mmCIF file of N, CA and C and ligand atoms in Angstrom:
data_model
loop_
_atom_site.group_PDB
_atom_site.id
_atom_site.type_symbol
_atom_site.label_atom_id
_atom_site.label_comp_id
_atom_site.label_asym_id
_atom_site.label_seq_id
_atom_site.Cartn_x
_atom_site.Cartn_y
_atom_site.Cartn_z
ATOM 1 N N UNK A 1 10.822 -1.410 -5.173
ATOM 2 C CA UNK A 1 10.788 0.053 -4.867
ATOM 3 C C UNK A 1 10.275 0.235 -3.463
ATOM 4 N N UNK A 2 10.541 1.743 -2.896
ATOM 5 C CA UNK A 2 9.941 1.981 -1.732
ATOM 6 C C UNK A 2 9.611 2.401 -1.632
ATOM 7 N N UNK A 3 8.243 2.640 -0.580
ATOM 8 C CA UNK A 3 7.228 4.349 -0.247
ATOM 9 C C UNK A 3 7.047 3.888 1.078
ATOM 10 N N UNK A 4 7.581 5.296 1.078
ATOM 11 C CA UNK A 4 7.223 5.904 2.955
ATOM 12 C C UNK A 4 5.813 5.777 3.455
ATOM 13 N N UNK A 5 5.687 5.523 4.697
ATOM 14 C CA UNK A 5 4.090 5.676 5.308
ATOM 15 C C UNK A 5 4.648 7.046 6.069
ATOM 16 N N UNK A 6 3.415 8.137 5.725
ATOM 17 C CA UNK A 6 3.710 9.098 6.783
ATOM 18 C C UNK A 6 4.931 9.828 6.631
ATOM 19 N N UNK A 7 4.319 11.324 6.756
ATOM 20 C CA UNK A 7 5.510 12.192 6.081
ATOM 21 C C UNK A 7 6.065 12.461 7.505
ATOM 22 N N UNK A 8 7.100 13.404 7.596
ATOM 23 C CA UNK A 8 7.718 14.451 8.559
ATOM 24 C C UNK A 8 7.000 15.367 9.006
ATOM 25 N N UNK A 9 6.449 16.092 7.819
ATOM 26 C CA UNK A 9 5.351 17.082 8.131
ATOM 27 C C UNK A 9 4.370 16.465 8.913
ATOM 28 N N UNK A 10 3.834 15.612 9.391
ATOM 29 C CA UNK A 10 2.449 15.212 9.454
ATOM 30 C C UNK A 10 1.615 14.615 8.616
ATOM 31 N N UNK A 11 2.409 14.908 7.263
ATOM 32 C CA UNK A 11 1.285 14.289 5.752
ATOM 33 C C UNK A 11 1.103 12.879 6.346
ATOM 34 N N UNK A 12 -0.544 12.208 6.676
ATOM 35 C CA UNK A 12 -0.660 10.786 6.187
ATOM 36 C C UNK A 12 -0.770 10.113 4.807
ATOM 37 N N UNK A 13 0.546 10.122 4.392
ATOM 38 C CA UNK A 13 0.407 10.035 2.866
ATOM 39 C C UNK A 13 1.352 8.935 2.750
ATOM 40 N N UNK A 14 1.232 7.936 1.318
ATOM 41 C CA UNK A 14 2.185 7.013 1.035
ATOM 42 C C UNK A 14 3.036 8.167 0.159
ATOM 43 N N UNK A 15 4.251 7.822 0.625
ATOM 44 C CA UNK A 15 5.542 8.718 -0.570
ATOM 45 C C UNK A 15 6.659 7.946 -0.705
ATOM 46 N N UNK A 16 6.202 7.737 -2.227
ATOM 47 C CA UNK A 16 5.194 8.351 -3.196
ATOM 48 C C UNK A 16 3.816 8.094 -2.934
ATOM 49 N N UNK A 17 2.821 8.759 -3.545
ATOM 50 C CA UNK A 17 1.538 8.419 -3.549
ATOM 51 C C UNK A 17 0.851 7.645 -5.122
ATOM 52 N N UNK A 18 1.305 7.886 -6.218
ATOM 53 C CA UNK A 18 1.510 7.702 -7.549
ATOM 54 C C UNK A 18 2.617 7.446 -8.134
ATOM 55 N N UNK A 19 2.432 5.763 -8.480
ATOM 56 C CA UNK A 19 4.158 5.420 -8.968
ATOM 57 C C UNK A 19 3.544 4.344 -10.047
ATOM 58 N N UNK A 20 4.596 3.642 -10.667
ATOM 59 C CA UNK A 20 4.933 2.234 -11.263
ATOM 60 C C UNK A 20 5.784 1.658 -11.018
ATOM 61 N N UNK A 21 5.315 0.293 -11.574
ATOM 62 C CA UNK A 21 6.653 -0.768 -11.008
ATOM 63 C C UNK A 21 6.292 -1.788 -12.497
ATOM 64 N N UNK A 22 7.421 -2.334 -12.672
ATOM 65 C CA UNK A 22 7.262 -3.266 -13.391
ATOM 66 C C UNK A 22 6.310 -4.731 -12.718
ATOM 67 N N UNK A 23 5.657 -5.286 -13.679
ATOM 68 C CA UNK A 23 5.118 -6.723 -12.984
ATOM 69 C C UNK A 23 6.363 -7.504 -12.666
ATOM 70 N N UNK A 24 6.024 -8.708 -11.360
ATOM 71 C CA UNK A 24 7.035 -8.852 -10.449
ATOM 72 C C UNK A 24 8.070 -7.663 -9.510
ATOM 73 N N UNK A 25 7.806 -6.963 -9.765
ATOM 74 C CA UNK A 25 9.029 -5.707 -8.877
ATOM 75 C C UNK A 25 7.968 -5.392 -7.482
ATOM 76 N N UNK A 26 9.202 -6.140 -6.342
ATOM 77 C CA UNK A 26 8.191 -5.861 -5.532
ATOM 78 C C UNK A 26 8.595 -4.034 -4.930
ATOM 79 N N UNK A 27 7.270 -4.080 -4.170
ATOM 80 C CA UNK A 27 6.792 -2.924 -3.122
ATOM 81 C C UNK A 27 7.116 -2.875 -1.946
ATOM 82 N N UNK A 28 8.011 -2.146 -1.232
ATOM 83 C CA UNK A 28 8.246 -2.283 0.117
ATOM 84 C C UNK A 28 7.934 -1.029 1.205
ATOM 85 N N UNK A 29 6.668 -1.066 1.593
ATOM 86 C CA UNK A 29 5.728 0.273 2.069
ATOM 87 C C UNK A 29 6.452 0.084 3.994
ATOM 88 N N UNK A 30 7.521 1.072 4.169
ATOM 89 C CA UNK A 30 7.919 1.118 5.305
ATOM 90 C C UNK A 30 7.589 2.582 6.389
ATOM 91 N N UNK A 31 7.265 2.277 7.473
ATOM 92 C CA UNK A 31 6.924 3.444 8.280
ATOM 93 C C UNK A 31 8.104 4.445 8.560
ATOM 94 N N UNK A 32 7.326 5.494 8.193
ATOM 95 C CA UNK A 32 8.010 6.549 8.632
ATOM 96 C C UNK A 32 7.957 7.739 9.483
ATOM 97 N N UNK A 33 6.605 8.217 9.631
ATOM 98 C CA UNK A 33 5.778 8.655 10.665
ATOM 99 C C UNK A 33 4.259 8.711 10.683
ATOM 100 N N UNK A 34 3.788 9.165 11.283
ATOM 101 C CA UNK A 34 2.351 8.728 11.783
ATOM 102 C C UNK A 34 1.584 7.688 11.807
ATOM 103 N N UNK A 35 2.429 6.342 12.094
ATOM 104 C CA UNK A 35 2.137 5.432 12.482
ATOM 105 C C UNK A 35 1.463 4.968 13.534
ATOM 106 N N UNK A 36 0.159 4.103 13.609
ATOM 107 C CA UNK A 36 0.142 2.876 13.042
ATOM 108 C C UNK A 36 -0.594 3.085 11.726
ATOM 109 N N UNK A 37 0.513 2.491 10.292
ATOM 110 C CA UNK A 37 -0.574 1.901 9.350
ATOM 111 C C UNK A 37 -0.590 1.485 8.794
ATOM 112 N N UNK A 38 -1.243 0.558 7.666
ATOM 113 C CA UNK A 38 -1.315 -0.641 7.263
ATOM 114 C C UNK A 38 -1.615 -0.500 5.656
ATOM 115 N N UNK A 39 -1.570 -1.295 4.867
ATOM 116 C CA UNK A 39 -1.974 -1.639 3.375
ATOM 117 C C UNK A 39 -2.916 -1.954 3.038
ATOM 118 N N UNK A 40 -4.032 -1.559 2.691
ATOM 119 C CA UNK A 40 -4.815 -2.545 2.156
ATOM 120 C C UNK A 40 -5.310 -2.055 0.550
ATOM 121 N N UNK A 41 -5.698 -3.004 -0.432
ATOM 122 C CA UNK A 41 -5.976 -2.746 -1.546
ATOM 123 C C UNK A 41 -7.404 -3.044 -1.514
ATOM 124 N N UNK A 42 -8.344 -1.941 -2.388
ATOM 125 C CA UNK A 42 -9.720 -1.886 -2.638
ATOM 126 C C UNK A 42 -9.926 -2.945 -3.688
ATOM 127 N N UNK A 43 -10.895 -4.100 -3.187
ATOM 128 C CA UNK A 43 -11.329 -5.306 -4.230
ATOM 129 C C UNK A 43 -12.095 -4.861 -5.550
ATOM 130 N N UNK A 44 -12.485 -3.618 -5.343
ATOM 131 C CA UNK A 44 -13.142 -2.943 -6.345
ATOM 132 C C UNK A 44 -12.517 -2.010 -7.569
ATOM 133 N N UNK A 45 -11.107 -2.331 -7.281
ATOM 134 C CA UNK A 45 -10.076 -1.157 -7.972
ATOM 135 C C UNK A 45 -8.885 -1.821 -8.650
ATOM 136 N N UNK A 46 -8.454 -2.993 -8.747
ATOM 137 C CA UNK A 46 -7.496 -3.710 -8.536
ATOM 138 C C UNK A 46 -8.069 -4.734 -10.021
ATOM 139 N N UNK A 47 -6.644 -5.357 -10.551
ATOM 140 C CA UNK A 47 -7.033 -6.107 -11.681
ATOM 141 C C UNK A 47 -7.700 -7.687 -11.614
ATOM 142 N N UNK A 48 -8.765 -7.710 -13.136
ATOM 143 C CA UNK A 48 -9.323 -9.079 -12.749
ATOM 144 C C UNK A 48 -8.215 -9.791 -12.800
ATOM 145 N N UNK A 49 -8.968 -11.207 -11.818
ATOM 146 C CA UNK A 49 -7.978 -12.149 -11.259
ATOM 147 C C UNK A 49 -7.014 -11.886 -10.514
ATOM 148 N N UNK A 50 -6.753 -10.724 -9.332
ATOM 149 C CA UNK A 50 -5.734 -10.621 -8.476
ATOM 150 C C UNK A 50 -6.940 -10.873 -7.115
ATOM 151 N N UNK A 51 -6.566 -11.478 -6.388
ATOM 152 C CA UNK A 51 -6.950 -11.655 -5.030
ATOM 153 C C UNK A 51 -7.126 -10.446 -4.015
ATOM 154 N N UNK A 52 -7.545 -9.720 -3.779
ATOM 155 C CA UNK A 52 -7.027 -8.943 -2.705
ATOM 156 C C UNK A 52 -6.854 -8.988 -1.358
ATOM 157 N N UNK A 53 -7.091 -10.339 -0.797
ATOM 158 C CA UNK A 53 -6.741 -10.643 0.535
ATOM 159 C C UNK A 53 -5.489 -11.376 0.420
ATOM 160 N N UNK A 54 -4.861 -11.696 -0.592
ATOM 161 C CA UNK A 54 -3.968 -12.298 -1.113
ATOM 162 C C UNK A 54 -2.531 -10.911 -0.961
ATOM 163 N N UNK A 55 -2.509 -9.531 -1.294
ATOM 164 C CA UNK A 55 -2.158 -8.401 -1.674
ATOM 165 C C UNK A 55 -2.205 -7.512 -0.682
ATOM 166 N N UNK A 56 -3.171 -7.695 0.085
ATOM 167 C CA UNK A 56 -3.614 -6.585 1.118
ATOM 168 C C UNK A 56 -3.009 -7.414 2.814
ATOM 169 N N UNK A 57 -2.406 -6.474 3.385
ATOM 170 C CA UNK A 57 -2.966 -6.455 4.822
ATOM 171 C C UNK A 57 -4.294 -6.777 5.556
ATOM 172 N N UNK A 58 -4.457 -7.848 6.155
ATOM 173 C CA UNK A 58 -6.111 -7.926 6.795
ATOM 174 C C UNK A 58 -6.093 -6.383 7.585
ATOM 175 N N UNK A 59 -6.971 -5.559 7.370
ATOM 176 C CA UNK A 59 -8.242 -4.496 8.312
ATOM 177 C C UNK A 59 -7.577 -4.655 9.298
ATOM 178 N N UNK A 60 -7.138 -5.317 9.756
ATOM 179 C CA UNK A 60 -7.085 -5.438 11.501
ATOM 180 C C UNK A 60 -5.531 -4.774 11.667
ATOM 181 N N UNK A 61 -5.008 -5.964 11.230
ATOM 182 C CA UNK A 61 -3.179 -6.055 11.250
ATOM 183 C C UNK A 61 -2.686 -4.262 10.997
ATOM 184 N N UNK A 62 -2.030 -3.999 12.142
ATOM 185 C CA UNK A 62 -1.299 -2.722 11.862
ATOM 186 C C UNK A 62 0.485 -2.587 12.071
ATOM 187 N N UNK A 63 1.058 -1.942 11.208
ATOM 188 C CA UNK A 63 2.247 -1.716 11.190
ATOM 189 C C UNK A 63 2.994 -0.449 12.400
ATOM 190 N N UNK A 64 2.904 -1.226 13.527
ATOM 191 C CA UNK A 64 2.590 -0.004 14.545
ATOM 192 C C UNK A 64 4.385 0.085 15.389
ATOM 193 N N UNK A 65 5.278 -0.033 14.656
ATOM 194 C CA UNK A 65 6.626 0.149 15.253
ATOM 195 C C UNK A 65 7.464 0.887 14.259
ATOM 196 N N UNK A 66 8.200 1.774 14.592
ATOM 197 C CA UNK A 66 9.060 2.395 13.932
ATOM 198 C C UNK A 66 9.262 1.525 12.734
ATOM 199 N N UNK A 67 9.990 0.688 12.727
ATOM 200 C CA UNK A 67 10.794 0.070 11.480
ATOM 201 C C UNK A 67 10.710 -0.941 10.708
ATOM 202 N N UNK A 68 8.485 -1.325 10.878
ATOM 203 C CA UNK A 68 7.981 -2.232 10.108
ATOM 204 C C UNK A 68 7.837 -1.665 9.043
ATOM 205 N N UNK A 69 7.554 -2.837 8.499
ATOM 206 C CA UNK A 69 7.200 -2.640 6.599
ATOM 207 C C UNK A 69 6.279 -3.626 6.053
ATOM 208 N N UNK A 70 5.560 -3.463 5.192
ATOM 209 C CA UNK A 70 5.183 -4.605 4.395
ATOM 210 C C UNK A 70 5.686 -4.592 2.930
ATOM 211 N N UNK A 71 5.962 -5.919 2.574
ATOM 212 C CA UNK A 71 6.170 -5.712 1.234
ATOM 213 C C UNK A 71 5.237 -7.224 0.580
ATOM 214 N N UNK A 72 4.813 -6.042 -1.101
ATOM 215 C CA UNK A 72 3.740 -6.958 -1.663
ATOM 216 C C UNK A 72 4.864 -6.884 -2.932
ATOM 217 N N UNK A 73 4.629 -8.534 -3.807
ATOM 218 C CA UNK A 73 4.504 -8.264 -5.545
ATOM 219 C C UNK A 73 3.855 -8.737 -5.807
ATOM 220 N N UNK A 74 3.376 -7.118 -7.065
ATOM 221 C CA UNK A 74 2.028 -7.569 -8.239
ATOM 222 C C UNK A 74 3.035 -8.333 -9.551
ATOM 223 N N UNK A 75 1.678 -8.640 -10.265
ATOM 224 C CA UNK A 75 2.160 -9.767 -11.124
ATOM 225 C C UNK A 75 0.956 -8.881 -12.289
ATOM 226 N N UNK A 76 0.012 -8.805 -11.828
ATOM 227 C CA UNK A 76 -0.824 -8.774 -12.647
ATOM 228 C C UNK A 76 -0.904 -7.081 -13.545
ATOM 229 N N UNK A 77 -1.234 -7.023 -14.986
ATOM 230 C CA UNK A 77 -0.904 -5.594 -15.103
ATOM 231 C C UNK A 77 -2.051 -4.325 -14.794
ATOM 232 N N UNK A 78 -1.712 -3.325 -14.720
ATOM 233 C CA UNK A 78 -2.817 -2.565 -14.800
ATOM 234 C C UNK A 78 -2.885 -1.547 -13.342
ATOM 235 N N UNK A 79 -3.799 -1.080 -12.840
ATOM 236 C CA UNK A 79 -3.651 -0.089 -11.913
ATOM 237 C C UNK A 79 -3.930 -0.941 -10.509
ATOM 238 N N UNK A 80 -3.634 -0.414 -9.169
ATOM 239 C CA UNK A 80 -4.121 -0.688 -8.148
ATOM 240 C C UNK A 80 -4.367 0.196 -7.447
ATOM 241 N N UNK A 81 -5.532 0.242 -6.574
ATOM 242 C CA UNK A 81 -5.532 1.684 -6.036
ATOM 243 C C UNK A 81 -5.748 0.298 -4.258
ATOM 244 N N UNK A 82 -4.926 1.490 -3.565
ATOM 245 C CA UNK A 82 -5.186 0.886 -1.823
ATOM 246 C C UNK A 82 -4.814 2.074 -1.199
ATOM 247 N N UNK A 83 -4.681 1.723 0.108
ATOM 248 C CA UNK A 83 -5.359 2.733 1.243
ATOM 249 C C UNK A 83 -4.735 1.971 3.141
ATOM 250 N N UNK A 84 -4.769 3.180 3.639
ATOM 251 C CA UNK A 84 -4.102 2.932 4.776
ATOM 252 C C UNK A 84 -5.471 2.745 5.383
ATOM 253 N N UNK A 85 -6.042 1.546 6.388
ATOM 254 C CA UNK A 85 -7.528 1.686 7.245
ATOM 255 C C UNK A 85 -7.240 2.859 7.740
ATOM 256 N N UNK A 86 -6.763 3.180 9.446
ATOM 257 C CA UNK A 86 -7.208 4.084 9.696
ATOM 258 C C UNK A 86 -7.450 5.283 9.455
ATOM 259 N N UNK A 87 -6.418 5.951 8.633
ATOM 260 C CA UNK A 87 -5.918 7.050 7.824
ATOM 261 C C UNK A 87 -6.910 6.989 6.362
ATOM 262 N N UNK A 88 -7.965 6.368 5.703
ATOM 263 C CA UNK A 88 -8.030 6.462 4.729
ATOM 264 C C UNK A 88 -8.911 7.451 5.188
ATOM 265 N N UNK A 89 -10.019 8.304 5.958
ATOM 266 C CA UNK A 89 -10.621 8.894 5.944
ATOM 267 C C UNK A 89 -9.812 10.443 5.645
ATOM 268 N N UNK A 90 -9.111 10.348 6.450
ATOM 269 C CA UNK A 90 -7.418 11.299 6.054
ATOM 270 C C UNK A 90 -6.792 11.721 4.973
ATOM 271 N N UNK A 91 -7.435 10.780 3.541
ATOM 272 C CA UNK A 91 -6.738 10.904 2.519
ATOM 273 C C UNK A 91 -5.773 9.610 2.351
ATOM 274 N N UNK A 92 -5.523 9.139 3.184
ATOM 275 C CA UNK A 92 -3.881 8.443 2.875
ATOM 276 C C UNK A 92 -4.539 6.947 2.162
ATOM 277 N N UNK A 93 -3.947 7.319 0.774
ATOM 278 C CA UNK A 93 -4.665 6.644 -0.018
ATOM 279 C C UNK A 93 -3.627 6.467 -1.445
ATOM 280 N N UNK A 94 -2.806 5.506 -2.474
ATOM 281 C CA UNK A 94 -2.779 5.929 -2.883
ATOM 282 C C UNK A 94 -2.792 4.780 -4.354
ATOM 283 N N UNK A 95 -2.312 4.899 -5.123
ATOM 284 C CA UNK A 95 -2.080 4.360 -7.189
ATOM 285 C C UNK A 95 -1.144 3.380 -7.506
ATOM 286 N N UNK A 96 -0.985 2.282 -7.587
ATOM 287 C CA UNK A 96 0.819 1.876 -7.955
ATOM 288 C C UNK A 96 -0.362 1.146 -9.724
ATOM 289 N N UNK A 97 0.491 1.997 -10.844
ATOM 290 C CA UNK A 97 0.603 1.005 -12.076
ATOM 291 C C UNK A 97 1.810 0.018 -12.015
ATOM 292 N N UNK A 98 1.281 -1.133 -12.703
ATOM 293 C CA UNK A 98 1.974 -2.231 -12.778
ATOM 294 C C UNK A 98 2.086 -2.420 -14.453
ATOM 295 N N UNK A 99 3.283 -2.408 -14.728
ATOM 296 C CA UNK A 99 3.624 -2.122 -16.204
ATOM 297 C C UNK A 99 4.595 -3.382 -17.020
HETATM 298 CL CL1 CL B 101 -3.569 -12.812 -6.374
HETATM 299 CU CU1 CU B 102 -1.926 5.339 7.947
#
């Protein structure tokens, strides 16, 4: 599946912001505007036994060109919650269940 970084409007939002995917179905989080930004998943939110440096974008690394993307697959079931660094103060933050 796919979600936008960054609306048209200005929203710093993943869109979707709240989704599912089946385990294995990957995620492909591509820029769309208000870029630069990046993935990262909260180690505190995410299921036991998933890695999150494993899942996440390092802090640093930014998706700062029109027509990057990252893409992750979960495996593991249950919720994940992550967040764009710079933008998370912004809100841009968002849910993927893994089903
Ligand atoms: Cl992992
Ligand atoms: Cu961002």
């Amino acid at each position: 599946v796919e979600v936008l970084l960054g609306g048209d409007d200005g929203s710093l939002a993943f869109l979707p912001g709240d989704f599912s995917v089946a385990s294995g179905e990957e995620i492909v989080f591509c820029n769309n505007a208000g870029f630069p930004h990046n993935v990262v998943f909260d180690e505190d939110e995410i299921p036991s036994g998933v890695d999150a440096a494993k899942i996440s974008m390092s802090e640093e690394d930014l998706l700062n060109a029109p027509g990057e993307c990252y893409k992750v697959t979960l495996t593991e079931k249950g919720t994940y919650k992550f967040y764009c660094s710079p933008h998370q103060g912004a809100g841009m933050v968002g849910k993927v269940t893994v089903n």
